[PDB]
mmCIF file of N, CA and C in Angstrom:
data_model
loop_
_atom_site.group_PDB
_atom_site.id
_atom_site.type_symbol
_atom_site.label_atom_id
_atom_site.label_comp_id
_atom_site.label_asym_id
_atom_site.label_seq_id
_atom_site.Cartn_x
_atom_site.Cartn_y
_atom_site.Cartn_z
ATOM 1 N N UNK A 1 202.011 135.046 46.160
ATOM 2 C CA UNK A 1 200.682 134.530 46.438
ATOM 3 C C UNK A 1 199.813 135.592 47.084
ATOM 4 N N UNK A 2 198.473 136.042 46.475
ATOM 5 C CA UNK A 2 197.589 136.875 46.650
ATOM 6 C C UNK A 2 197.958 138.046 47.537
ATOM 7 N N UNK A 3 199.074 138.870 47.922
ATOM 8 C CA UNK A 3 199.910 139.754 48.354
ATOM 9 C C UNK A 3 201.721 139.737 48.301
ATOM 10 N N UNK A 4 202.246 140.773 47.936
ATOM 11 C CA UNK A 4 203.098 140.835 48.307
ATOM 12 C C UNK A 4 204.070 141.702 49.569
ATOM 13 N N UNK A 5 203.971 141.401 50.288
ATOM 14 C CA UNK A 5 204.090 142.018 51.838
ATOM 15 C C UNK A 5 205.040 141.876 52.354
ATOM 16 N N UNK A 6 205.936 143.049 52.276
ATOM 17 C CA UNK A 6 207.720 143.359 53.061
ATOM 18 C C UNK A 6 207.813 142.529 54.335
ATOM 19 N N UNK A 7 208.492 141.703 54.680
ATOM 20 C CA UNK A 7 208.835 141.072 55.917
ATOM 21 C C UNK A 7 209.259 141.870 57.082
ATOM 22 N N UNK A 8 209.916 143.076 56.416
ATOM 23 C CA UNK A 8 210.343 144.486 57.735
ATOM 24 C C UNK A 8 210.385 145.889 57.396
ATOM 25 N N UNK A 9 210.419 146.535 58.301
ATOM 26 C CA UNK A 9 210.900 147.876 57.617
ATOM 27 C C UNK A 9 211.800 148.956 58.284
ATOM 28 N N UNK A 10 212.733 149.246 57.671
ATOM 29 C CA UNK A 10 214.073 149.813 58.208
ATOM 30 C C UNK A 10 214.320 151.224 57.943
ATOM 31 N N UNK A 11 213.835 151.589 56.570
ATOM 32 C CA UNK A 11 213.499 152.900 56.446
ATOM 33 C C UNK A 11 212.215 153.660 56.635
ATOM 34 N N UNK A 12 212.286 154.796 57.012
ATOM 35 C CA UNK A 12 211.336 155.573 57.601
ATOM 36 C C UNK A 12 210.886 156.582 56.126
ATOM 37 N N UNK A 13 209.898 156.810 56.701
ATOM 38 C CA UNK A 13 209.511 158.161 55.087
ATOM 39 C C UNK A 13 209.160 159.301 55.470
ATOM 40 N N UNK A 14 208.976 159.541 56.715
ATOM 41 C CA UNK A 14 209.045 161.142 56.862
ATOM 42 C C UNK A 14 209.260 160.532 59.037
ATOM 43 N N UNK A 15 209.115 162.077 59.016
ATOM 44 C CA UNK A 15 210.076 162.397 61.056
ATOM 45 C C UNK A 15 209.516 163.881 61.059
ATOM 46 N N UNK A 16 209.705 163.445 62.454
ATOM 47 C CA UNK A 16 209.543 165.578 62.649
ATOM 48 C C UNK A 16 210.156 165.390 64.342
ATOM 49 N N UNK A 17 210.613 166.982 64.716
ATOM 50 C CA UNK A 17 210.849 167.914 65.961
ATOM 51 C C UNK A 17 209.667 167.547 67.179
ATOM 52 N N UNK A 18 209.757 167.366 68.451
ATOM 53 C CA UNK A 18 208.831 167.629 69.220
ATOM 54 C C UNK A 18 208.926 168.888 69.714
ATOM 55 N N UNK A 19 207.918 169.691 70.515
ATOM 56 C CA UNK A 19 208.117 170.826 70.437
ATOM 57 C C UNK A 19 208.802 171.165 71.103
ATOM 58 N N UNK A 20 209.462 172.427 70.596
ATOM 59 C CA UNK A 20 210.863 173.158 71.139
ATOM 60 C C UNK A 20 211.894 172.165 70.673
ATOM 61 N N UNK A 21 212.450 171.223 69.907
ATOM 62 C CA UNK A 21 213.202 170.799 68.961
ATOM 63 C C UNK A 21 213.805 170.249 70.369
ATOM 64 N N UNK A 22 213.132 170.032 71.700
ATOM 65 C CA UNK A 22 214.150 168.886 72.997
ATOM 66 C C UNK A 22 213.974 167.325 72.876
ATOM 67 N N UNK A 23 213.429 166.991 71.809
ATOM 68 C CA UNK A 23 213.276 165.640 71.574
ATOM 69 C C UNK A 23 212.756 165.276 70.235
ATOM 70 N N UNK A 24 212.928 163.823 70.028
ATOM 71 C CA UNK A 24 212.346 163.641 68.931
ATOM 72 C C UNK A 24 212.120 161.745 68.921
ATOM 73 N N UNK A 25 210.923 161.378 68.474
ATOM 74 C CA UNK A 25 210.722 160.142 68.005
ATOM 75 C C UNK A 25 211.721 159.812 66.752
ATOM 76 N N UNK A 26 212.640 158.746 67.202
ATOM 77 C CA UNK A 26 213.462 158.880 65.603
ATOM 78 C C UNK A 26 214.148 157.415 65.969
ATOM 79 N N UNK A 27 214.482 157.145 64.810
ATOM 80 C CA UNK A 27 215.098 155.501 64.328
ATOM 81 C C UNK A 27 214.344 154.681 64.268
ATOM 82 N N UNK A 28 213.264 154.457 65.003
ATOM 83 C CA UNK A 28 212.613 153.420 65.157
ATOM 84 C C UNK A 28 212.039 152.284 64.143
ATOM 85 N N UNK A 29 211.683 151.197 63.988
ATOM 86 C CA UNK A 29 212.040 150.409 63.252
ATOM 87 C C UNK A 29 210.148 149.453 63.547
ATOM 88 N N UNK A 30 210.125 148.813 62.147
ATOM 89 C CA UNK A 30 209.168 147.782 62.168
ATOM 90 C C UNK A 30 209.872 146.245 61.498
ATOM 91 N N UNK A 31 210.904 145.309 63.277
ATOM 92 C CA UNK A 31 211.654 144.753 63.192
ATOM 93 C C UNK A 31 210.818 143.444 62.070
ATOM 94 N N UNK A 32 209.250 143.009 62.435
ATOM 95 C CA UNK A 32 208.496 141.824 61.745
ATOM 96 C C UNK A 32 207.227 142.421 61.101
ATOM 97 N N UNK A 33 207.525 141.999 59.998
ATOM 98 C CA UNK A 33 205.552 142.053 59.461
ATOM 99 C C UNK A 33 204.979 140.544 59.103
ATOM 100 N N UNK A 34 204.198 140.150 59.374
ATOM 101 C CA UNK A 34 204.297 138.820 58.997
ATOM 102 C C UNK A 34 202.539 138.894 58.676
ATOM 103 N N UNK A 35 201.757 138.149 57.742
ATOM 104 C CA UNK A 35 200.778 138.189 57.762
ATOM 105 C C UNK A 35 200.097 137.028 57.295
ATOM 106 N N UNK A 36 198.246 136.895 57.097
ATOM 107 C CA UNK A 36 197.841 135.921 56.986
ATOM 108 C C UNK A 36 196.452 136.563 55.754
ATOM 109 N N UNK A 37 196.154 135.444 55.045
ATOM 110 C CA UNK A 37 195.172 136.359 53.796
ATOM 111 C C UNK A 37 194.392 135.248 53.760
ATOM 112 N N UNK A 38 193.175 135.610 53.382
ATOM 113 C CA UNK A 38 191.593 134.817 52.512
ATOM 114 C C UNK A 38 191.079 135.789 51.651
ATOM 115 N N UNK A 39 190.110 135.239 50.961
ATOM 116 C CA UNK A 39 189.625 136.382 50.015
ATOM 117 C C UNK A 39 188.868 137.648 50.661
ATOM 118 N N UNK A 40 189.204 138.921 50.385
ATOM 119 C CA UNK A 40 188.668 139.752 51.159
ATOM 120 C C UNK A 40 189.153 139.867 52.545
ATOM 121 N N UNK A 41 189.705 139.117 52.700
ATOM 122 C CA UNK A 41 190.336 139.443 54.125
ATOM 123 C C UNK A 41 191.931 139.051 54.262
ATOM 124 N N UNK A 42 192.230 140.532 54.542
ATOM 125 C CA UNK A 42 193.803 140.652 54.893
ATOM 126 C C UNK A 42 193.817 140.683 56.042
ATOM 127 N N UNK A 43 194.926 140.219 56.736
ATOM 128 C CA UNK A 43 195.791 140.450 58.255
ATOM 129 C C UNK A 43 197.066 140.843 58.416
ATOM 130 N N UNK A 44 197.150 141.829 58.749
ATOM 131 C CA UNK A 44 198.615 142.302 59.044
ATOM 132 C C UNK A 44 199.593 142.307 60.148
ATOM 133 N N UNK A 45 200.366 141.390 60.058
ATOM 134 C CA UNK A 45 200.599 141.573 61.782
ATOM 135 C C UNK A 45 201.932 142.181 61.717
ATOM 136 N N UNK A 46 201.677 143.076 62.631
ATOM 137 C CA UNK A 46 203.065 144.272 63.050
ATOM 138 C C UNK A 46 203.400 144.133 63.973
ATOM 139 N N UNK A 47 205.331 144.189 64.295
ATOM 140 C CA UNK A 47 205.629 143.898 65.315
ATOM 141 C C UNK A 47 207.009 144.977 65.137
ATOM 142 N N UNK A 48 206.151 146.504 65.458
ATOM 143 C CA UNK A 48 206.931 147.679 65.765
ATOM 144 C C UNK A 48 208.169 147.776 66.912
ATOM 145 N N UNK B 1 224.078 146.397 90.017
ATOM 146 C CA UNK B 1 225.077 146.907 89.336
ATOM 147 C C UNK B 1 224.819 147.337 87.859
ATOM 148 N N UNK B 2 223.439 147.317 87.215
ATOM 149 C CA UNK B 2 222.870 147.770 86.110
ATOM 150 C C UNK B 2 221.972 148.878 85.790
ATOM 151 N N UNK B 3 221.725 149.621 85.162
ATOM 152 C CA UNK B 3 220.645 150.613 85.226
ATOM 153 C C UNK B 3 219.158 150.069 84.806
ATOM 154 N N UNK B 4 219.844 149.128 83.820
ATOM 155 C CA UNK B 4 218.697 148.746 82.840
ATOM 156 C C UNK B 4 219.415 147.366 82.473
ATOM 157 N N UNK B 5 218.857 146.125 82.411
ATOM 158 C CA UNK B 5 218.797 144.987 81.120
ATOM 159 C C UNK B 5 217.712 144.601 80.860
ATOM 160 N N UNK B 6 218.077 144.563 79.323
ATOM 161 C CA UNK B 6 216.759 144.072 78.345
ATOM 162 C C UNK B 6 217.506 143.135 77.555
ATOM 163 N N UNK B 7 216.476 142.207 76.957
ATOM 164 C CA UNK B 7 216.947 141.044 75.426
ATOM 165 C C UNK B 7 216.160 141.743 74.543
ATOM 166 N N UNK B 8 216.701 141.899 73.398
ATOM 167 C CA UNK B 8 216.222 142.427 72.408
ATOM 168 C C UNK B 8 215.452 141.305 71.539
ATOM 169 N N UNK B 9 214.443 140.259 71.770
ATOM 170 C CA UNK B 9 213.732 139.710 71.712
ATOM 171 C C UNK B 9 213.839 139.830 69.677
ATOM 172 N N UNK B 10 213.802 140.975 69.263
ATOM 173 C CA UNK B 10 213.466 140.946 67.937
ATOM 174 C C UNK B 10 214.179 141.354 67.370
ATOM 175 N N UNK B 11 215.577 141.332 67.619
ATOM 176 C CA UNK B 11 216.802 141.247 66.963
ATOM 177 C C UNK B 11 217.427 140.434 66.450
ATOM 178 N N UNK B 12 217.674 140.258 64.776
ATOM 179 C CA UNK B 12 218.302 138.757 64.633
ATOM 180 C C UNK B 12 219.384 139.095 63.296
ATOM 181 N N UNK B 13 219.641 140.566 63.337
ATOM 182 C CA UNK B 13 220.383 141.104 63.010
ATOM 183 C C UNK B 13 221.243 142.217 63.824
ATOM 184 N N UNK B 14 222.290 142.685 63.087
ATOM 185 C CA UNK B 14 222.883 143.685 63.501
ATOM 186 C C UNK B 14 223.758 144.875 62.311
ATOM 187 N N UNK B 15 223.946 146.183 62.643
ATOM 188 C CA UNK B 15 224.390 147.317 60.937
ATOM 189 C C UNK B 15 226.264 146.613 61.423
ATOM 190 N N UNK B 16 226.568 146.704 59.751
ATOM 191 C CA UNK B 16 227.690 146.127 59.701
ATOM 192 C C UNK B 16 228.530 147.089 60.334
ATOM 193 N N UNK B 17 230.264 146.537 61.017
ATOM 194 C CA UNK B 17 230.963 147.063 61.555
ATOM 195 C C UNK B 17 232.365 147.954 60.712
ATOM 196 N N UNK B 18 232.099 149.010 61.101
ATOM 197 C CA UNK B 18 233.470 149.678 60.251
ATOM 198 C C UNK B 18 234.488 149.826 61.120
ATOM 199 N N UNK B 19 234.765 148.850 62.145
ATOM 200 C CA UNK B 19 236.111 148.995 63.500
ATOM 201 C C UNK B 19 236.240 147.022 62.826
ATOM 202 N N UNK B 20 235.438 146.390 61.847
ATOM 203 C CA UNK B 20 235.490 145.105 62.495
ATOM 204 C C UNK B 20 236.932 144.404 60.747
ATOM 205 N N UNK B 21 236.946 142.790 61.052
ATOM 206 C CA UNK B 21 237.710 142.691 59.470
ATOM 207 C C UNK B 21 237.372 142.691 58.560
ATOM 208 N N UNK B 22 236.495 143.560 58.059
ATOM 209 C CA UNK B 22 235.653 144.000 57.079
ATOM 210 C C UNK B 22 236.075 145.666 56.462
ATOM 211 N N UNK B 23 236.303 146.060 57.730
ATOM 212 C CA UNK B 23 236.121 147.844 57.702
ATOM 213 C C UNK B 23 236.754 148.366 57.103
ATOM 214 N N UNK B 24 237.962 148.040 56.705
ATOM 215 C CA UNK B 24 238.787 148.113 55.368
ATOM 216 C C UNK B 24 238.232 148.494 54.023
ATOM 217 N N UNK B 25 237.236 148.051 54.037
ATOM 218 C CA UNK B 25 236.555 147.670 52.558
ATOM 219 C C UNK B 25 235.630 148.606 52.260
ATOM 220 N N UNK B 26 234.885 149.094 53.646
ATOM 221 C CA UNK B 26 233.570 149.603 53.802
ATOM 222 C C UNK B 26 234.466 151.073 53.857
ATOM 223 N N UNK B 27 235.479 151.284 54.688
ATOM 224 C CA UNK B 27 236.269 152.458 54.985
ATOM 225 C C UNK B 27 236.499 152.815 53.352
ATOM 226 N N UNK B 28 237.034 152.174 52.686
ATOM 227 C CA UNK B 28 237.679 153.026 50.890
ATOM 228 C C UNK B 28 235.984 152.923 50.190
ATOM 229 N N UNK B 29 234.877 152.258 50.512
ATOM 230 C CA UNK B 29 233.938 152.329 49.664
ATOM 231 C C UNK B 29 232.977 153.816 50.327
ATOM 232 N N UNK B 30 232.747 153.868 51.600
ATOM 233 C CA UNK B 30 232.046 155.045 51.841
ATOM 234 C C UNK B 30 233.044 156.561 51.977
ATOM 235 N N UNK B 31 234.196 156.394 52.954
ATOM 236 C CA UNK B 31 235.121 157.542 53.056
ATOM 237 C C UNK B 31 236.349 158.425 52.147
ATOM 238 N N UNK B 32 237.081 157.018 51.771
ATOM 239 C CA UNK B 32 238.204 157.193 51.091
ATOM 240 C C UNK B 32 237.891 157.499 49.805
ATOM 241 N N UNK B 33 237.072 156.418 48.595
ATOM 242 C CA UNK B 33 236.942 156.812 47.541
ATOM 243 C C UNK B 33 236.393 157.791 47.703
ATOM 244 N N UNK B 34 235.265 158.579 47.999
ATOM 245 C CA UNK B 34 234.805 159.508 47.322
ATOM 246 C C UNK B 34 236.222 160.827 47.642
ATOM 247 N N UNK B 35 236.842 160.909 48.806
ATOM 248 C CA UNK B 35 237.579 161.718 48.952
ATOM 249 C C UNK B 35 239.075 161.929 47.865
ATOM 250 N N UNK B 36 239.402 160.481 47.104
ATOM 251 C CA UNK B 36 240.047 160.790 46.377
ATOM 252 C C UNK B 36 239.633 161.276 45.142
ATOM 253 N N UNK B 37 238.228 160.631 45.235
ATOM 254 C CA UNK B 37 237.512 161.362 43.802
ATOM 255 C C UNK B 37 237.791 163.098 43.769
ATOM 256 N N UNK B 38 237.091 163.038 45.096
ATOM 257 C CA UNK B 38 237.136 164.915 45.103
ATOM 258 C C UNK B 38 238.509 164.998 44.550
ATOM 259 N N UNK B 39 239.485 165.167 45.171
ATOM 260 C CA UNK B 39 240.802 165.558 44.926
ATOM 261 C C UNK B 39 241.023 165.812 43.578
ATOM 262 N N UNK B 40 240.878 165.012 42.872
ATOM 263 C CA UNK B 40 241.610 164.266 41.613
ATOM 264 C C UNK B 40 240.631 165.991 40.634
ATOM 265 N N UNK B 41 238.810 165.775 41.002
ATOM 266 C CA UNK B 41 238.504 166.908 40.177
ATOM 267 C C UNK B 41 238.809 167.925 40.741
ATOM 268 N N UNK B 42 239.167 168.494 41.738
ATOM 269 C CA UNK B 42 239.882 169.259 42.298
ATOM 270 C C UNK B 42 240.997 169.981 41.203
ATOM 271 N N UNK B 43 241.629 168.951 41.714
ATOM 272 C CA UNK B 43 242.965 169.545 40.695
ATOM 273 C C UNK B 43 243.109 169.851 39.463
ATOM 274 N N UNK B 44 242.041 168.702 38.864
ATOM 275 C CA UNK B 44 241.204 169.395 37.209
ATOM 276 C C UNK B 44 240.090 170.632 36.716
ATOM 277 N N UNK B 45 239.886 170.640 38.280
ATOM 278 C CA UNK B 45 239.224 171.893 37.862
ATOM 279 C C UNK B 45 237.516 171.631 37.562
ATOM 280 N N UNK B 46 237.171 170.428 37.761
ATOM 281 C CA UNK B 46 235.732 170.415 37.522
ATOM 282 C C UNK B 46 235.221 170.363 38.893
ATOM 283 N N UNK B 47 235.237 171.648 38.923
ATOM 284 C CA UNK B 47 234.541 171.976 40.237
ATOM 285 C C UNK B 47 232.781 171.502 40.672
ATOM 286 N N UNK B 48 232.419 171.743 39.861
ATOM 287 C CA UNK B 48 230.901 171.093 40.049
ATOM 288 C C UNK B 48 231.112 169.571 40.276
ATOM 289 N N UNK B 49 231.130 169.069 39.269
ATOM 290 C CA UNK B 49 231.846 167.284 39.993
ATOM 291 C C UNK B 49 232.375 167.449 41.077
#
């Protein structure tokens, strides 16, 4: 019905090094997507 | 006596266990087979495989 919209997301599509390679943002996950639609108007709700 | 507790509020899963009665299965499908695969072309000689 008028979108089709992933419920989560588990894989990532790109990452990188913080500088000097002592850390890094990594695994992290988008556990809910849940959303709401009218014409012309989408809502996305993320729950990173 | 804790450093930290949290509820993981948005957890309603968990990644399957390879210590659990399952791991058997998961152990010959990710580790074992491919290692006997190797072997086997190994010994045949198709080294690229």
């Amino acid at each position: 019905e008028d979108y089709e919209i992933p419920s989560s997301v588990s894989s990532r599509k790109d990452y990188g090094w913080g500088d000097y390679y002592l850390s890094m943002v990594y695994n992290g996950d988008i556990p809910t997507i849940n959303y709401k639609a009218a014409s012309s108007d989408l809502k996305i709700y993320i729950s990173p | 006596h804790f450093e930290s507790v949290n509820v993981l509020n948005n957890i309603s899963s968990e990644p399957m266990d390879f210590s659990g009665a399952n791991s058997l299965y998961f152990w010959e499908l990710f580790y074992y087979t491919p290692m006997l695969v190797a072997q086997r072309l190994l010994h045949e000689q198709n080294f690229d495989e």
